[PDB]
Design a protein around this ligand. Structure first.
Ligand SMILES: CC(=O)N[C@H]1[C@H](O[C@@H]2[C@@H](O)[C@H](O)O[C@H](CO)[C@@H]2O)O[C@H](CO)[C@@H](O)[C@@H]1O[C@@H]1O[C@H](CO)[C@H](O)[C@H](O[C@]2(C(=O)O)C[C@H](O)[C@@H](NC(C)=O)[C@H]([C@H](O)[C@H](O)CO)O2)[C@H]1O
Ligand SMILES: CC(=O)N[C@H]1[C@H](O[C@@H]2[C@@H](O)[C@H](O)O[C@H](CO)[C@@H]2O)O[C@H](CO)[C@@H](O)[C@@H]1O[C@@H]1O[C@H](CO)[C@H](O)[C@H](O[C@]2(C(=O)O)C[C@H](O)[C@@H](NC(C)=O)[C@H]([C@H](O)[C@H](O)CO)O2)[C@H]1O
Ligand SMILES: CC(=O)N[C@H]1[C@H](O[C@@H]2[C@@H](O)[C@H](O)O[C@H](CO)[C@@H]2O)O[C@H](CO)[C@@H](O)[C@@H]1O[C@@H]1O[C@H](CO)[C@H](O)[C@H](O[C@]2(C(=O)O)C[C@H](O)[C@@H](NC(C)=O)[C@H]([C@H](O)[C@H](O)CO)O2)[C@H]1O
Ligand SMILES: *[C@@H]1O[C@H](CO)[C@@H](O[C@@H]2O[C@H](CO)[C@@H](O)[C@H](O)[C@H]2NC(C)=O)[C@H](O)[C@H]1NC(C)=O
Ligand SMILES: *[C@@H]1O[C@H](CO)[C@@H](O[C@@H]2O[C@H](CO)[C@@H](O)[C@H](O)[C@H]2NC(C)=O)[C@H](O)[C@H]1NC(C)=O
Ligand SMILES: *[C@@H]1O[C@H](CO)[C@@H](O)[C@H](O)[C@H]1NC(C)=O
Ligand SMILES: *[C@@H]1O[C@H](CO)[C@@H](O)[C@H](O)[C@H]1NC(C)=O
Ligand SMILES: *[C@@H]1O[C@H](CO)[C@@H](O)[C@H](O)[C@H]1NC(C)=O
Lengths: 483, 484, 484
């Protein structure tokens, strides 16, 4: 007659690694890496992205004839641009501090186009001839919608002197431009005056632009260029313009209220009519895990980006003193095996099992819950002449990856070694617990099993489970069986 | 007739957490997170803050009339500027590379204002009428004090050609400016000549400033602007000024000796006449504790900022099997025995042990605290409105490190808290196995950590077991079969 | 008779630290910190760096007379510059976006000099008189080799209009410059035209340069300055020049193919005809170790840089059986046995237990080493004097990362060394318990980890664990009569 101690086993093929052991099959495990995304582009905390479709921020702000004319959405969480937008600046040129405009515009609380300078103004200049085949619309030379390319009237370009006082109680993005002529004959044809200037002045601005009449290479069929510039007029200030030529005037402006920052995402994915707290260019993440492998460039409260393909934490017994585990036990992690004629089968320690499941559950939940995330946009906004600042971002991003990867990977290895010793310690505690309540009525064979001199009743079996066994009641019976 | 092995207990209400257990009341513990600051702005390593008050670094340098600081301080460790300094540039304008000047001027070993171009010079120009109500002094038109606004004399502005050769052994901070006049008449009225220029040349500097005459908005009452520029003249180089008009010319300059860096702090806290190693905008920290939760923007040899509100390590043991419940009675040690016989009773501690524990856990707390390597650092923002992307780059780094330290520090507590408690469970079990290894046949195992000696328990064998000199042949036959 | 379980000890003086103990002497150890370097500058992944000697990138590119005319380096992995390169820009001036050019030119797959505008292309201008003392070859006045200083011919300077179309299939780096004169007399003398300009236009480039004529101090004996600019002409684009004076024209240009980035290294070490994955200014590293301390500014796949002098992991035993005994005698194993019978006395090892620990300890070492195989390429420093704020950003970052790696590395070594030592303690106790679980009634526990044999024992009887199930009743009667 005998009794043994044992641990649970199942069909699980899940394999974990420890700091000292590799490829250890376990009964239960948990991965703390999120590898899943929804594959769509969603709202971020209830606000929809501004999806510019084959347009750039420049083509949308200035009025590229082939960009959407109306701003349907008054607010966005992020701007979604295609990798190499097709439309941009139809008339070749430049937009000043473009990348900083895009950061300001990446998340806007309120956006609303308003007419600031009506074409009714400029009665002595021409408002109708300012078109180019570079900016085509419906088979006709057109031009940017929200600015005006003024031209000479009757071989006369009177100097312009115009002001706009912001009465709107909100900041105003205002845009203007300079046309760089290509020869001295072209200059006088478009603007009678041969030497020209643009003077822009606000409370914070003092600008003089002068054309650069020079030979350049054709882009979009034109050798001319247009350089655009922008300012924000604060709620009760004025902007003052003066020019005798080469003035791409403002017609429409945009009311801006800004309370937050995010980034421009370069993605071809499509809107999914969903909501998310974490967004990648490949898709959105719905996870509470600490780490992920979906994409570097995320927006929102996102898991940490690591280089690991799997991060699996053992939460159970090793699966096959006791030579092996009991596939037969089906009601607890730690248990007893009884052998008497009255009955046969297995049994399991209720309290010890729940203590351990709470133990490993709290170990996992801590690792997950201790991670706190800051809303952050990992997008990158730098020019061809800002490539040294680009590497700082790369160094930062890459360094945190190497940190988060090494820490997460060794946390798993270390804590799995602790998780496994935790199990084998609990079982031996039950073995010794039985050994002390069975001092002389038992012998040790070394296989986690005792030798019953006494005849253990099923009630005795349960009396030893409770620990309510009385050794005096059966001490003499052992002396009889012995020798 | 039994002897029991047990551990210490007290009245502690302090709780710690571990990976597998939460809200566990323990006897002794230590918090490695510092939360307290002195509420005042202090000196740093024995050097004093340049507490500029309601005046910008620009206003003080150029000599805004409304600021009472001239050569008050010759050495500083950090600058304190208010969030929106009231005075700044009294005449509307700008200062080029201001944010970089504030970095250069952030820590200066030697600063001295020296007159460099005297008003005795410029004898063909008017040095007396260069005032504006924008710069007001005591209700009367005034101007910046370390610079001279030169206007016409006798309806003439002869061209200025002047030079200054640094005869000092220290580098010099020299400041000049340009007036952008509002209309063609105001140009002629202030400087006879209609079209003007400012050339500035050194060994590194080649400048040409031309005025921008344009309609602009009224700031501090004037539609005009003055834009200021700066250079550092090396010890035997010379600066060369040529101007037709519109020249704001240097009268004074500053001798500069720089040997380190430390940002501009934004605070309204006041000088406490103290010294610190670590300065927050809300106060100062005097701790060896490795982590802190007071302010992000710290200047000095500082701990590491975390989002934690509590980072309590556990130095002792648990509080109310081998010890079904701990004994509150023991006051002299962490690990100890209890004797039960008519001769005597009570709880008695161990000395080879208990101190071994104290020494080991305390070395653990010190090892965590000591291995933090402190780098003097300045966390402060010096980025303007068109440098927000570099500013986000800064915030991403700052936030990335916060999240790195917070996670590791909290898991380190949770992980090392479990090992501490299991260390204590291990220490008790060793002594129980030693008592069983001494007495073998003469006593029986009860199972509650309380050995039962069939033979009468001896106060004299107590210290004997404590040391292991107990003799079992002495009482072998005695109570060989005491029960039947 | 007697049998005893013990562990190994040797002559090792190697000491380690745990979280709870300090200077613990161990039998075996392993350092995961690399301190050895090659002491020379090597190839980086099979590609030889460009060592520019005492010429700067500007001097090499523009053709300082005192530099190698050209070199057979079409490809290079990084650029090695001296701390203060001597030759640089002989004629005083500037190169625009120099630090970005050095980044672009830092790793280049194809670099070839080609002649884009011949001296034949300047019929009505002088190609030969454009020389200066500041730029000297053999004491003789010379000038930059790859650009042409064009001056008047026949007291006349007809305005220039030249265009170059990049027929090649690679990008071209093109350089040009403007000459700032000193006085109006200088201007007319070299360029009859008093008021001059330079327009440069490509598909993306729209430039107007105009000379600044002012007095400046002497640098390299000349008070004038020459400011240089660059662009990258794309295949099938054209560059269009126009000037009536002060034009330092392009003569040669560079065919560039760029596929990567890798900083300029400031170093004086000599080339070693070696190859390495990691290069340091002091020398090269050939290590798989996770961390190092050789120098911060490394380029290549490199260990993490920490502030530690040693990071020693315990891989062995505590060194001076299971109770208070380190056996120097058993050289044959790690865990082992000692027998004391009438046959003799000697030492034995347990191979099934010794190997289980060696395999596990090597995994501890290997896991810590190999899990940080997230080595990536890296860089050094590249910012100017008006870029100190961005330079601080770099420093806060690489310092902050240093504080993260050193604190994490050291605690890991302290934590796992504590765990290693405890892991050895549990192994011997299980050997003791194996021998204890067998031979239960036939032996006496003496308190030293050694058992007392009541019955007589043979060398063959011990048999270590070879049998492992020595007959419980074969000698049970003999020990029953050995009782008293
Ligand atoms: C309409 C056209 O194609 N014109 C074309 C001209 O036309 C040929 C002519 O040479 C030949 O003798 O007779 C043919 C009929 O039998 C036919 O009429 O061919 C010359 C060949 O070199 C072209 O240059 C010329 O094209 C115009 O050239 C202009 C100057 O170079 C300029 O590039 C014109 O482009 C526009 C544009 O579409 O952007 C024309 C716009 O109306 C004009 N807008 C404004 C507000 O002025 C715009 C502007 O001038 C420039 O963009 C400013 O830099 O240029 C191009 O059609
Ligand atoms: C001088 C004056 O009071 N001007 C005044 C103007 O004319 C008055 C008139 O109202 C009164 O009836 O009779 C006076 C004669 O006794 C005189 O004719 O009235 C207008 C009404 O709107 C006032 O705005 C005007 O004020 C002056 O206007 C100037 C030009 O716009 C200028 O803004 C003056 O400000 C100063 C300044 O205080 O900054 C005056 C300084 O002395 C002057 N400093 C220097 C070195 O030249 C300074 C300078 O011109 C500009 O800052 C350069 O841009 O301007 C303001 O008082
Ligand atoms: C020709 C000469 O040596 N000039 C010399 C001048 O006159 C000497 C005199 O000292 C000596 O005693 O007798 C000589 C006759 O036998 C002659 O009369 O003396 C002054 C005294 O200070 C010297 O500075 C002066 O030296 C020249 O001065 C120039 C104007 O300041 C200029 O700096 C000359 O430098 C060069 C140069 O080497 O860079 C001369 C180059 O040929 C010239 N190159 C071109 C393409 O024009 C170059 C150019 O003018 C400037 O760099 C443009 O800014 O300047 C220097 O020798
Ligand atoms: C400023 O004056 C000093 C002292 O005169 C100049 O330094 C040189 O000093 C020697 C001896 O004192 C003089 O003989 C030289 O004339 C000076 N060198 C030169 C090249 O001028 C210093 O250079 C002067 N600075 C300038 C550029 O005016
Ligand atoms: C420089 O030359 C190349 C090849 O001539 C130019 O590319 C064009 O080649 C096509 C071939 O069908 C010609 O029809 C066009 O005339 C060429 N020019 C254009 C404007 O497309 C290249 O464009 C020329 N570069 C410049 C800007 O002049
Ligand atoms: C493994 O055992 C579980 C019992 O819960 C069973 O549901 C599952 O189907 C088994 N898997 C296989 C492949 O038999
Ligand atoms: C604009 O008008 C507001 C009142 O509407 C006035 O306070 C302000 O001075 C004006 N701004 C300018 C500079 O024209
Ligand atoms: C340690 O012992 C071994 C074997 O006897 C020997 O090879 C080695 O030289 C010894 N090391 C020292 C420092 O004595």
């Amino acid at each position: 007659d005998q009794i043994c101690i044992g641990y649970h086993a199942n069909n699980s093929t899940e394999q974990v690694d420890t700091i000292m052991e590799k490829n250890v099959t376990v009964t239960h495990a948990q991965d703390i890496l999120e590898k899943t995304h929804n594959g769509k582009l969603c709202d971020l905390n209830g606000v929809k992205p501004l999806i510019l479709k084959d347009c750039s921020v420049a083509g949308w702000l200035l009025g590229n004839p082939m960009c959407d004319e109306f701003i349907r959405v008054p607010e966005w969480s992020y701007i979604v641009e295609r990798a190499n937008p097709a439309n941009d600046l139809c008339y070749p040129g430049s937009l000043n501090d473009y990348e900083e405009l895009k950061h300001l515009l990446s998340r806007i609380n309120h956006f609303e186009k308003i007419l600031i300078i009506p074409k009714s103004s400029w009665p002595n200049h021409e408002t109708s001839l300012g078109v180019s085949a570079a900016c085509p619309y419906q088979g006709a030379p057109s031009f940017f919608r929200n600015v005006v390319w003024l031209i000479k009237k009757n071989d006369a370009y009177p100097t312009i002197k115009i002001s706009y006082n912001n009465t709107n109680r909100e900041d105003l993005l205002i845009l203007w431009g300079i046309h760089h002529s290509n020869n001295a004959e072209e200059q006088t044809n478009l603007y009678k005056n041969p030497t020209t200037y643009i003077s822009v002045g606000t409370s914070t601005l003092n600008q003089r632009l002068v054309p650069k009449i020079a030979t350049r290479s054709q882009v979009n069929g034109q050798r001319g260029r247009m350089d655009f510039f922008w300012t924000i007029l604060k709620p009760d200030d004025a902007i003052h313009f003066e020019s005798n030529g080469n003035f791409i005037a403002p017609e429409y402006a945009y009311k801006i209220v800004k309370k937050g920052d995010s980034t421009i995402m370069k993605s071809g994915v499509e809107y999914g009519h969903c909501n998310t707290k974490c967004q990648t260019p490949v898709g959105a993440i719905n996870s509470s895990m600490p780490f992920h492998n979906i994409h570097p460039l995320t927006i929102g409260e996102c898991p940490k980006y690591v280089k690991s393909n799997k991060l699996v934490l053992a939460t159970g017994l090793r699966n096959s003193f006791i030579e092996g585990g009991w596939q037969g036990m089906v009601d607890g992690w730690y248990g007893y095996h009884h052998s008497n004629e009255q009955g046969s089968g297995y049994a399991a320690d209720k309290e010890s099992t729940q203590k351990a499941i709470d133990g490993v559950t709290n170990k996992v939940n801590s690792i997950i819950d201790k991670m706190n995330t800051q809303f952050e946009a990992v997008g990158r906004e730098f020019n061809n002449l800002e490539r040294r600042i680009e590497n700082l971002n790369k160094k930062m991003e890459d360094g945190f990856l190497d940190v988060w990867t090494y820490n997460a990977e060794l946390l798993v290895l270390m804590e799995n070694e602790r998780t496994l010793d935790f199990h084998d310690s609990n079982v031996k505690n039950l073995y010794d617990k039985v050994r002390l309540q069975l001092r002389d009525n038992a012998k040790e064979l070394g296989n986690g099993c005792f030798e019953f001199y006494h005849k253990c009743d099923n009630e005795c079996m349960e009396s030893v489970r409770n620990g309510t066994y009385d050794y005096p009641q059966y001490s003499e019976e052992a002396r009889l069986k012995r020798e």
